[PDB]
Structure formats: C-alpha cells, structure tokens
C-alpha cells in the first residue's frame, strides 16, 4: 500500500495532532464552497511561503471531523501527498511516474471519498491526474509566481481549479495567531511564553525578518526562543554555578593546607573551612529552592500534557457517540486533572535572576539579533524614543536640508501616533537639484526605520517612459509580454511589504505609470496586470525630481516656493499633487554645508582606518578643506563629485604613503593645499 507518501490529515485531526487554526474563516468557506461545486471543484491556494496555506487545509480537516461541513464532505478522508519525499526521493528514472501512478490508483480503488491535498503543486508540473471524472478531489497550494510560471502554462489542467488568494496577515492578525497558539507551544517545549514576547515577535518579524512572511516568521521566532529557554531552564543558574565552584576550590585548598606545618597556614586553613561553610550556607538554600521549583514546573507541564490527552479522548468519545467514556473524562478525569494544575500553579507563583523558564521580550530581541546581526542594544530602544529625536538621527547623515528632515520626521510621527489615514502610506515628493540629498535622505530613512539599506527598493522612472512599460511595473494578463516576470512593483509589495519604494526622476514616468502611483498614494493598494489587487498599507513612497533646480540659487526662501511648485503643477495633475503627504523642496548646498559634507566623508575614511589595524589619523587644513569643497561642488551635479575627488587627490596618495611607511602608526596624515592643489604629505622620507 502506497501509504508511504501520504498522511491522513482527517485522522490527525481526531488525534489532536493539528495545532489550532485562528481566523481564516472566509478562506475555509471558499474552499468548502469550491469543493461542493460540480463545475470546477478543486481549490488551489495561492500565497507567499508561510502565510498559512497549509493550516487552512488543516482547518478543513478539523471541520470534516466536527461535522461542520456540508453532507457531501462529511465522510471524506483528506490526504496530504508528500510531494517533497516523492520528487526528491527519486531520480530521472521512471520512479517518479511509477510512484505517483501507484498513489493515484490507490485513491482510485478504495471506496472512501478522498480529497487529495498537494502542497507545492507546481513541483508536479515539472504528472497527469486527469481523474476528473469525479474520482478525486484535489486541493493545491503554490505561490503566485510559480502558479504563473508553471501552473498557468497548462490551461486545460488549470481551468479545473479555482484560485483562492491567501493574503499575508496583518501584525494585529499575527498576534491573534500567536496568542491562539500560545498554550500549544507552552506545553510542547515545557516553558512559559509572555504576551509581550508575542507582541515583540510579531512586530519585529515584520520589521526586521523581511525574508520570510508572517506569521511563519513570528512563529519560527517564538519557537526558537522557547527552545533557547528549554535548555536554560535545564541548566543551573549562574550563581549556583559560581558558588559550587568556589566551594570545590576551597575543599581543594583545605586538603592542601592541612599538610603544611607552619603558623600562617593553620590560621588560614581554619579560615578556609569557614569560607567553605559560608559558601555552603548560601548555596544549600538556593540549590534546594531551584530543584524544589524545577521539579514542580515539570510536574505542571506533564499535568498539562495529560489534561490535553484527556481532552482528545473526550472529544473523540463525544464524536463517536460513546457517552459512557465521554462522561468519565468530561465530568471526572478532566476536572480532577484541571484541579491538579490549578493547585500546582497557584503554589508556583506563591513560592517565589533564577530558574529562567519564560520567553520574554529580551529572549525575542536576542534571538533576532543573532539572526539579523543587529546589536541587541538597537532593538531594545522603543520606537517612540527614536521618533522623538528623528531629526537628530537623520541630520547626522543629511546636511543642509533641515526643512526636508523636519517634513519626513513629522509625517512619520503622524502615522505612528495614529493621526494619519491608516489606509494611505506616507508619500513624499523630493524636489531639488541633483546631489543635494534627495536619494541620501531616503537611504537614511531606510537605515533609521529598518536598520538596513536593503529595506528600500529603487525604481528608475527613466525605464518606464512609454505606455508599453506598465506591464513591467505591474505584470500582464496570461499570454502577454511579461506575464511570468510579473511586475516590479507588485512583486516587490508581496515579498517586501515593509519597504521604502523610491521612484527616481518621477517626472519622466509615463502617465499610465503615474496613475499607478496615485492609486498607491490614495488607496494604499494597487491592481496588478491580471486585475488582482495587491496590498500596500505598510510601505513608504518616496519620489524624487529635479524640476525646481532652475529657481534655486545658493542661499530656505519662501517666494521661490511656488515657482518650483508651479513648475510641478503642469507636469503633474493637481489630484496627483494633492494626494502626496508632503511636497518637500531641497535647496542648493552652501559653501559651509559643502565643507561639513567633506568632514563627514573623512570621518568615514577615518572609521575604516580605525576599523582596520591602522592608527593613522587624518587631519585636514582649513584651506585644503576649502579647495576640496570648491572643487567638489557643481551647480549641475551637486555634491556627487565629492566622493571621487577625495579618492583621487587624497586617498590614492594616502594609500601609497601608508604602505611605503612614510606615514606610520600613531602619526597624522596631514592633507594640505600645496601650490594650489590638495595633497597629503609624508612624515618620513623614503
């Protein structure tokens, strides 16, 4: 029998082997409704990895055994085909075909009405279960991209399925899932889980673990924290460790001192016995309280496990009409058990760091820090603290755009405090000359909000200038130009919801593409090429332009404000400009502002020198710093030429002199203005 490749999900439901399903009621109704059709009655779940496609099928198994299904599905055996163990457990040989025909024909013959679930069904499309006589009912699962690239390219097979879009849960929806799962993961690892950790896991998974989708990214995070405390609780506390070792040390010293015959040894041998006794007097109360209390936390955890097992037997008794055994458990066994837990737990808090058996926000922040590589100190700081000094944090990166930094900071504060439309993402149009900070501010925002430059995604509107390019942005219907690649924007929103979308040189976008941005800015959601609406409530929109550099001379001025804004009113329609949260204007950088930018860059070069072994300190004379700022600025490219200019004039020679030994450890690399050209001079002749 080819039960080697399938697991009975309906069986697992009767045995309490399926963790609870939270929410997702409308999706399970859709699956039931599709299955009950006679038309195309095979649902295919379409969603990103980890959004909960499988647990939807698991909920259906729970509904089949609980009679919460229509009659046509009540006596169904819902089987899950292990396609992973099928294609990987096989080679090019004819065993893939032979193995699947075997299972497909065991389904054929036996007389249970059987619904086959195949997760990652695209792996079966590179095979032919055309048993659509009404022999088998199938539930498929895959991602949207793989549905497009592998399932959508065999229409005849596809048309017998009906899409069910499974969107990613909100953070709020995610904690409801984690809260509902809380007790299962408590009893499983034998530890306790605080609610603030659950809120921490959901909020942090969405913000920093952008590589995996909710709620899986939050589930994996709590599960790893719990496993990290499963070993902490089975280890002696730190103070019992330290005490026990000094005690063993003093016992060594006592045996040794008792051998030496002299006046000073005997006076401290007696002191060593006392020090040993003092340690033992501090250690015995503690070591006793620890074991006393780890033995009870373990007695509680099995008390919880027999309770759960009783409820499985009780649910199955009442399901099978055995009222005799169902009365045993529901009225006597289970409340006798529940009374044992109530008493053992009540004394637990009453007994009363030590015995770490709790998943707290610290354990979540530490687990994430190891995975994400961000220092734990940066994850403990409250969002409210950062946002209150946001202008401070950005101004360390962006010079001379105080009016811009204030606008970005105020808009973000408006949304975490709940005063901005919750269906509209913050939207920005940066306007001003090249090399003034428009892109840089957006990078600083990315690293401030998500502590990662990757959190921003860049779209260059120079590549979306014609009406033909819209399919590149959102995708295309089947059989069209770029149906399979999808859209750049739509695919970015599905896989990186908490992102900053930078649209560079937005003035060049085709009017059809601008229309998509207005939908993004106004409704917080867009429609892809196939009518599907993808969500975007949790992104940030930054658009950059330079249509105002004509009226900005190096000097911010308020009369110049509407000459650039009237230049904007003809390129963009008034409804476009009205739906932008803040139209922000960058002015040209002054000579003093250009000079601090130079100090910023030497400070970074100074950091790499310090980050490596070298104790070389870069100091810049005033007039040399002045020539760098004069050679660096350009009325056309702003501060862009500055990074390369320093490299060419200062850094090239500074390298050579370091490796030549003409600037040694502990000395200063003095960069001067000699004969009107910036140079850095040696400190020792060759």
Q: Which residues within the stretch 650-669 sit at the binding site for ligand ADP (CB under 6 A)?
A: none
Question: Which residues in 147-206 contact ligand ADP (CB under 6 A)?
Answer: 177, 181
When asked if residue 22 is in the footprint of ligand ADP (CB under 6 A), the reply is yes
CB of 554 to a copy of itself, least distance (A): 31
Subset of residues 32 to 71 that bind ligand ADP, contact rule: CB under 6 A? 47, 49-55
Binders of a copy of itself among residues 469 to 528 (CB under 8 A) are: 478-479, 483-486, 491, 494-495, 497
Assess 640 for contact with ligand ADP (CB under 6 A): yes
Selection from ligand ADP, a copy of itself, none that 465 binds (CB < 5 to 8 A by kind) is none
Q: Answer with the entry of a copy of itself, ligand ADP, none that 63 interacts with (C-beta below 5 to 8 A by kind).
A: none
111: closest CA among 76, 158, 143, 67? Answer: 76
Is residue 65 part of the contact set for a copy of itself (CB under 8 A)? yes
Query: What is the radius of gyration, based on Cα positions, of the chain?
Result: 34
| Selection from 449, 455, 454 nearest residue 412 by Cα | 449
* Binding to ligand ADP, residues 373-402 (CB under 6 A): 398-401
Bridge partners (DSSP) listed for residue 618: 669
Name the residue with tokens 């009325």: 635
CA 195 to chain centre: 19
Joined tokens for residue 559: 């009369």
Backbone angles phi, psi at 4, to 5 degrees: -65, -25
CB 174 within 8 Å of CB 202: yes
Reduced to 3 states (helix: H, G, I; strand: E, B; else coil), residue 67 is coil
Using rule CB under 8 A, residue 132 touches a copy of itself: no
Which of positions 395-434 make contact with a copy of itself (CB under 8 A)? 410, 413-414, 416-422
For a copy of itself, the binding residues in 299-328 under the rule CB under 8 A are 301, 304-305, 308-309, 311-312, 315-316, 318-319, 321, 323-324, 326-327
Comparing C-alpha atoms, which of 227, 364, 358 is closest to residue 297?
358
**CB of residue 490 to ligand ADP, shortest distance in Å:** 19
**CA angle centred on 586, ends 566 and 628, rounded to 5°:** 140
Q: Residue 429: name the closest of 566, 550, 590, 565 by CA.
A: 565
Distances (CA, A) of 490 to 210, 215, 461, 543: 16, 21, 15, 17
Residue placing its CB nearer to ligand ADP in the complex, 313 or 494: 494
Decide which of ligand ADP, a copy of itself, none touches 436; Cβ closer than 5 to 8 Å per partner kind. ligand ADP
Closest CA to 507 of 460, 575, 442: 460
Q: Which does 24 bind (CB under 5 to 8 A by kind): a copy of itself, ligand ADP, none?
A: ligand ADP
* Number of shown-chain residues binding a copy of itself (CB under 8 A): 121
In the complex, least distance from residue 449 CB atom to a copy of itself, rounded to whole angstroms: 15
Question: In sequence order, what are the residues at sequence separation of 6 or more whose Cβ sits closer than 8 angstroms to the Cβ of residue 294?
Answer: 233, 234, 355, 357
Cβ closest to a copy of itself, residue 411 vs residue 577: 411
Binding mask 546-575 for a copy of itself (x = CB under 8 A): ------------------------------
Sketch the per residue contact string, 580 through 609, with ligand ADP: x for CB under 6 A, - otherwise. Answer: ---------x-------x------------
Considering beta carbons, is residue 537 or 640 the nearer one to ligand ADP? 640
Phi, then psi, of 540 in degrees rounded to 5: -130, 135
Q: How far, in Å, CA of 640 to CA of 645, rounded?
A: 9
Minimal distance, residue 95 CB to a copy of itself, in Å = 12
Does 505 sit near ligand ADP (CB under 6 A)?
Answer: no
On the 0-12 / 13-18 / 19+ scale of CB atoms within 10 A, 43 is buried
List interacting residues with ligand ADP (CB under 6 A).
Answer: 19-24, 47, 49-55, 177, 181, 215-216, 219, 398-401, 434-440, 544, 589, 597, 638-640, 643
């Amino acid at each position: 029998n080819l039960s080697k490749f399938c697991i009975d999900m309906t069986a697992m439901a009767r045995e309490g082997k399926i963790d609870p399903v939270i929410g997702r009621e409308e999706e399970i109704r859709r699956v039931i409704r599709i299955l009950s059709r006679r038309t195309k009655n095979n649902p295919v779940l379409i969603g990103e990895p980890g959004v909960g496609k499988t647990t939807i099928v698991e909920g259906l198994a729970q509904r089949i055994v609980n009679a919460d299904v229509p009659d046509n599905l009540a006596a169904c055996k819902l089987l899950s085909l292990d396609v992973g163990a099928l294609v990987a457990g096989s080679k090019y040989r004819g065993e893939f075909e032979e193995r699947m025909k075997g299972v497909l024909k065991e389904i054929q013959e036996s007389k249970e009405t059987i619904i086959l679930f195949v997760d990652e069904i695209h792996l079966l499309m590179g095979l032919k279960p055309m048993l659509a006589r009404g022999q088998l009912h199938c539930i498929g699962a895959t991602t949207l991209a793989e549905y497009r690239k592998y399932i959508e390219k065999d229409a005849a097979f596809e048309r017998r399925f009906q899409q069910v879009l499974v969107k990613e849960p909100s953070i709020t929806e995610t904690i409801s899932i984690l809260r509902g799962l809380k007790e299962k993961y408590e009893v499983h690892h034998g530890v306790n889980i605080a609610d603030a950790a659950i809120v921490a896991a959901a909020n942090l998974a969405a913000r920093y673990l952008t590589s995996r989708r909710l709620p899986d990214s939050a589930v994996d995070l709590i599960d790893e924290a719990a496993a990290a405390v499963r070993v902490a609780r089975e280890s002696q506390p730190e103070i019992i460790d330290s005490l026990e070792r000094r005690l063993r040390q003093l016992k060594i010293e006592i045996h040794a001192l008792s051998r030496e015959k002299d006046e000073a040894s005997k006076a401290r041998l007696a002191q060593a016995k006392q020090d040993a006794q003092n340690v033992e007097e501090e250690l015995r109360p503690l070591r006793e309280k620890y074991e006393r209390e780890r033995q009870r936390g373990k007695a509680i955890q099995e008390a919880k496990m027999k309770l759960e097992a009783l409820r499985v037997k009780a649910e199955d008794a009442s399901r099978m009409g055995d009222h005799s055994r169902a009365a045993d458990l529901q009225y006597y066994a289970i409340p006798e058990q529940e009374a044992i837990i109530k008493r053992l737990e009540a004394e637990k808090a009453a007994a009363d760091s030590m015995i770490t058996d709790v998943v707290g926000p610290d354990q979540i922040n530490e687990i994430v820090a190891r995975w994400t590589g961000i220092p734990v100190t940066r994850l403990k700081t409250s969002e409210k603290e950062k946002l209150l000094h946001m202008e401070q944090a950005l101004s360390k990166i962006v010079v001379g755009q105080k009016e811009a930094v204030q606008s970005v900071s105020n808009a973000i504060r408006l949304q975490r405090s709940g005063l901005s439309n919750p269906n509209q993402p913050p939207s920005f149009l940066f306007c001003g000359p090249s090399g003034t900070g428009k892109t840089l501010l957006t990078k600083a925002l990315a690293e401030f909000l998500f502590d990662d430059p990757k959190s921003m995604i860049r779209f260059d509107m120079s590549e979306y200038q014609e009406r033909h390019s819209l399919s590149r942005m959102i995708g295309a219907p089947p059989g069209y130009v770029g149906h399979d690649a999808g859209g750049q924007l739509t695919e970015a929103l599905r896989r990186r919801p908490f992102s900053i979308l930078l649209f560079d040189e937005v003035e060049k976008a085709a009017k059809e593409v601008l229309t998509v941005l207005l939908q993004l800015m106004d409704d917080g959601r867009i429609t892809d090429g196939q009518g599907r609406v993808v969500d975007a409530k949790n992104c940030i929109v930054v658009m950059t332009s330079n249509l105002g550099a004509e009226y900005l001379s190096r000097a911010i001025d308020p009369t110049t404000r509407e000459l650039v804004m009237n230049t904007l009113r003809n390129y963009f329609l008034p409804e476009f400009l009205n739906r932008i949260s803040s139209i922000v204007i960058f002015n040209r950088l002054t000579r003093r502002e250009i000079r601090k930018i130079v100090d910023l860059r030497i400070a970074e070069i100074q950091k790499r020198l310090t980050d490596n072994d070298r104790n070389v300190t870069i100091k810049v004379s005033d007039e040399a710093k002045d020539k760098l700022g004069a050679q660096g600025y350009s009325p056309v490219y702003g501060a862009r030429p500055l990074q390369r200019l320093l490299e060419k004039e200062v850094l090239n020679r500074l390298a050579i002199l370091i490796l030549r030994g003409q600037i040694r450890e502990g000395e200063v690399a003095c960069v001067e203005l000699v004969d009107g050209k910036v140079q850095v001079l040696p400190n020792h002749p060759d």
